[PDB]
Amino acid sequence: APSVVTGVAQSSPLTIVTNPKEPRQPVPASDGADYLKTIPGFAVIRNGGSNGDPVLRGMFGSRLNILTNGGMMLGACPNRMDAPTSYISPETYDKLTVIKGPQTVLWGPGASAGTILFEREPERFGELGSRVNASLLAGSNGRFDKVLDAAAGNRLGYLRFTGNHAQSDDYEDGAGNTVPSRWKKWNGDVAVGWTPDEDTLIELTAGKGDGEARYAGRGMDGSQFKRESLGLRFVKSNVSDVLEKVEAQVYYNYADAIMDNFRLRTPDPSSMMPMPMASQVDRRTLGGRLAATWRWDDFKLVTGVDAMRNEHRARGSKYDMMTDYYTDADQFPWSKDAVFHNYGAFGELTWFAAERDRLIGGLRLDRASVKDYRQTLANPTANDTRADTLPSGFVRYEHDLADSPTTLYAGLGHAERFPDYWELFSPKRGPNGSVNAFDKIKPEKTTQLDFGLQYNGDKLQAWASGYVGVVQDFILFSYREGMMGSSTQATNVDARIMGGELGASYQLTGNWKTDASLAYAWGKNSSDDRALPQIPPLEARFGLTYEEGDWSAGSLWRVVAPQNRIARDQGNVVGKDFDKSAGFGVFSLNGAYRVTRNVKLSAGVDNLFDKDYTEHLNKAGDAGFGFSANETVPEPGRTFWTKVDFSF
Ligand SMILES: [Cu+2]
């Protein structure tokens, strides 16, 4: 029976696995963050119509470790207008995996909050054959998506093409105002795979993508988000009796971004930027991974190394005051400001004691350097390099109850994250006493305890996952004051965090089903005896479902508490806290019909009751567009969408 997705269970301890090709009930804006909105734990900062910044249990930014096909794609805007999830079209992947908390060491450094894994799976052709999947979505406000996934091959290897094109106009809020929010996005990507015998795979991949998006939050819109990307991966299997797998992969991703104030808006003569202005930035990322999995019937061991160089450059437009001329950014040389390296080694080990007891541990050690290539701002850290060695690891114990189909789990984790591009270069001020941020921001050290349970019964599925943690040298942003616009200062503080997520799924009759989910996050700034900023409020979802093995309808109610813990004028590189937030409820409806084996119809109405509201985390709306300099960007009002999936 064909459904429409509205939440995801925790399928295993701390681990959520979904297929991002299923329709989702608050229809996602064709980016990475909106596909995480359905998973309890995740909030999204809103910037406009798309390209939100994702947040997991209140943690922001590089604390989330988002990988696409094992590789890592970093954007270039100093103010994270193109966060790593903005280059992702989840409709083109096949699997989405979320691992909550510092509880894997297999996928790179600094995963304090969690790991997110969008991946393509290799084809499985036997005889000579072909396969086409395609989808079309029309919705309110000029929403149109077009998605294609096609492949061909036999048992010796395959060609696969995936690609999408998606766009929408400005949406409107619960009060009929239109919000600066149009966007456009395309992606094209090729993969060639060689399977010379059943144990061997060599796959080669490349693609490009591009997009634009109007940003209600910011003083500039994204007129270009160019992506060029390349990858190679080698996998052998059954190398020996113990050696079960050897994986090597190299990835190259390149981001090339243009933000300006004149292509998607007109400059605004009251603001700090009253003339046409364009900012061009790029980000070149090269990395790879080598890994061996060993298996001997009571133990599994995975050992590997991984590396990563990333480079960052900028160049602006000019504008002559006495001529009204305007020279563009591409008429000038790129100016490097930062290069980052990381090398790491890792080991993860599982013990299958009995069949109701499981022990997992992992360790990883990291060498992480950054060089500051800025010559001026003169620059007291010009051409300075700095590094650190960061041990990280975790232990998880899982035990199944002999009685019921219940699983309990507890785990302890410790993660050290080196500061990222935004934490060292983007803040105009560093800590009191510092020459700048690059010199003094210390790495972040998180120590967290994760616990929860699973119940998979006949009519009743349920899961919970809680966390408690301290964070030493949490990298906090303080906007505090303005002097020519708002300027930030990065600092290090100690903090306490705690929260959890739970959910439940009950089968009423054979056709009727209802589910629920709750998500909480709490955070204290222990160094200053106040709350942590940018924490989302407690939130709850209720769904009702009718399936008749041919077609289904669904109802959804999202209920969100107010947030009364705020730390005004503090936050991250993207947003600051200003006001306690109002709660709200939003109701939604969906159906689905299987027309034939190949053609599946879906449709929904989002926010049926046209609620006027704003999430706590959304950006502070511009004021060049009519906002009171602090009101946050409003969520869309009533919206309809319809989608056809065909798989011939
Ligand atoms: Cu920008």
Author numbering: 67 to 443, 453 to 723
Could you give the paper's own sentences about this structure?
Here, we show that Pseudomonas aeruginosa OprC is an outer membrane, TonB-dependent transporter that is conserved in many Proteobacteria and which mediates acquisition of both reduced and oxidised ionic copper via an unprecedented CxxxM-HxM metal binding site. As indicated by the successful structure solution, OprC contains a single bound copper and shows the typical fold of a TBDT, with a large 22-stranded β-barrel occluded by an N-terminal approximately 15 kDa plug domain that, like in other TBDTs, completely occludes the lumen of the barrel. The copper binding site comprises residues Cys143 and Met147 in the plug domain and His323 and Met325 in the barrel wall. The CxxxM-HxM configuration, which coordinates the copper in a tetrahedral manner, is highly unusual and has, to our knowledge, not been observed before in copper homeostasis proteins.
Since Cu(II) prefers histidine nitrogen as ligands and Cu(II) binding sites often contain one or more His residues, we also cocrystallised the H323A mutant with Cu(II) and Ag(I). One strong anomalous peak, at the high-affinity binding site, is observed with Cu(II), supporting the SEC data that the histidine is not required for Cu(II) binding. H323A (approximately 30%) and, in particular, M147A (approximately 60%), have relatively high occupancies after copper incubation and SEC, indicating that these residues contribute less towards binding. All 4 residues in the OprC binding site contribute to copper binding, but not to the same extent and, in some cases, not equally for both copper redox states. By contrast, removal of His323 still allows Cu(II) and Cu(I) binding.
